[PDB]
Design a protein around this ligand. Structure first.
Ligand SMILES: C[C@H]1CCC[C@H](O)CCC/C=C/c2cc(O)cc(O)c2C(=O)O1
Ligand SMILES: C[C@H]1CCC[C@H](O)CCC/C=C/c2cc(O)cc(O)c2C(=O)O1
Ligand SMILES: [K+]
Ligand SMILES: [K+]
Lengths: 268, 268
């Protein structure tokens, strides 16, 4: 029942995408590692509740690696939002609910603010607003050093579930290993300053639902909680840390379904 | 230069207390374990900056165990605030800066709201507003099982620094061993519903500075961040988790001194 295919957009990207289901559109934007197999279980669970679910690998990452250098260097939320709109145009997805974590969170907030006619509602998770020198400094290391360091960071610091993270399996981890240097050189120095949360009044009254991982250390996304509360944006928790779609796929799928259903009711 | 002594208040409590220094009064209220030796390093560092620092074991706990049963059963923030005001009266402390963590945080907010003429400013850390069935349920266990469970929780889950926690020493841990069952039977079922946070407008404009541990899991005091933000109260982080005065005594002492100095400037 799942489409697994490629589609090229006029900006030069050849995307790998997956799609399952019929009904209102839900789009699952990856985190910075750009790997959509992390959504595999949840895509089926969400689609089974009466939705068309689309996901894709991000430009320069995994099976979307055929893309111009501009799309994976000096990456900002606004650049990513432009690219996501390009694939939604190519797939004739006019109105979408969107999810994203980390750089994907920045992307979906930029999508909602910049393309209000295209986005029904956005779910943002763990939106990075601060530069972290220990991550930025990986960009000048050799590729294999980057991959070794960031594979360890993902498993031990932010996966939210080491067994589930490892159970993604060798094929996924081999694609992540190749993505780490692309992410390191393109994302950590330029994503946080691009965060679309400087203007709290621009967030007020928008169809935005914000989450942070329940187990994430308080210091990581303290600023998200403050910002969301100042803007009156609905803010809450999901189990685990940065990858609830990996660590807790059934809870993640339920959250996406219930939040989409809440906005379909409010839309009427 | 440390005074270590006792004082009896007409509510029936014989307090063990310590005092060091000369200057404006700073009072360090313990967390629910009621053990003021946890402040030993910080008391000297704060006092050295030109303050009179007072701390004490809490009623029923450690060396303040000569107290009526009503002071260590069915404990609320409002009962604890009344007890702290009784020792401040006995020591002729008319105007005080106060610190407290956990039940101590509920106590110092209740102090600031209930006794505004007595409290220059309050620092609250990790204020418990939710009932936790796994803690409430320890109250029906045998004393030795309560002590084994809670000693493990403090050391391995929430110390913010296991080496520093162990280095409190054998005599402190022997006192804590006896306090665990008193705390379990008197605190977790009644402290959270007593939280002086139901009226957000009552906190607005008050000289309150709120913190959460940077390493504490987000879910534990997410609600504190939301409430402080809604009230416009200054909210930030200390290193560690529930016991910054044990895990990071110098950082804790600098925070207490700088916060006190900020309110002495605002006062004038
Ligand atoms: C893979 C994902 C993990 C997030 C973990 C946690 O949510 C955040 C801690 C690690 C930070 C990751 C990050 C930083 C940044 O500046 C830009 C980014 O795209 C990311 C990112 O996408 O990190
Ligand atoms: C000992 C201290 C540890 C705080 C750990 C963390 O700050 C909070 C997790 C454990 C809960 C603490 C707690 C709950 C409560 O209902 C009443 C209390 O007096 C406390 C309390 O003082 O906890
Ligand atoms: K699950
Ligand atoms: K320290």
């Amino acid at each position: 029942m799942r489409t697994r295919s490629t589609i090229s957009t006029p900006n030069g990207i050849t995307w790998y995408y997956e799609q399952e289901g019929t009904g209102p559109d839900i789009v699952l934007v990856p985190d910075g590692l750009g790997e959509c197999q992390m959504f595999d279980s949840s895509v089926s669970q969400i689609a089974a509740q009466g939705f068309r679910v689309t996901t894709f690998d991000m430009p320069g990452m995994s099976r979307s690696a055929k893309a111009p250098a501009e799309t994976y260097t000096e990456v900002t939320a606004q650049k990513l939002a432009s690219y996501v709109i390009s694939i939604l145009d190519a797939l004739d997805i006019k109105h979408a609910t969107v999810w994203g974590c980390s750089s994907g969170a920045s992307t979906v907030v930029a999508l909602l603010l910049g393309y209000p006619d295209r986005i029904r509602n956005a779910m943002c998770h763990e939106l990075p607003t601060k530069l972290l020198d220990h991550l930025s400094n990986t960009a000048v290391l050799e590729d294999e050093e980057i991959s070794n360091i960031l594979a360890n960071v993902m498993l031990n610091d932010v996966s939210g579930g080491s067994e589930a993270w490892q159970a993604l399996g060798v094929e996924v981890h081999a694609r992540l290993h190749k993505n780490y240097p692309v992410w390191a050189r393109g994302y950590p120095r330029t994503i946080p300053p691009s965060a679309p949360v400087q203007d709290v009044e621009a967030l007020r009254g928008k169809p935005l639902d914000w989450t942070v991982g329940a187990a994430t250390p308080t210091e990581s996304f303290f600023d998200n909680i403050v910002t969301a509360t100042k803007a009156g944006v609905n803010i809450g928790l999901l189990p685990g840390m940065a990858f609830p779609y990996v660590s807790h796929p059934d809870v993640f799928a339920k959250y996406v379904v219930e939040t989409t259903q809440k906005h379909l009711w409010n839309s009427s």
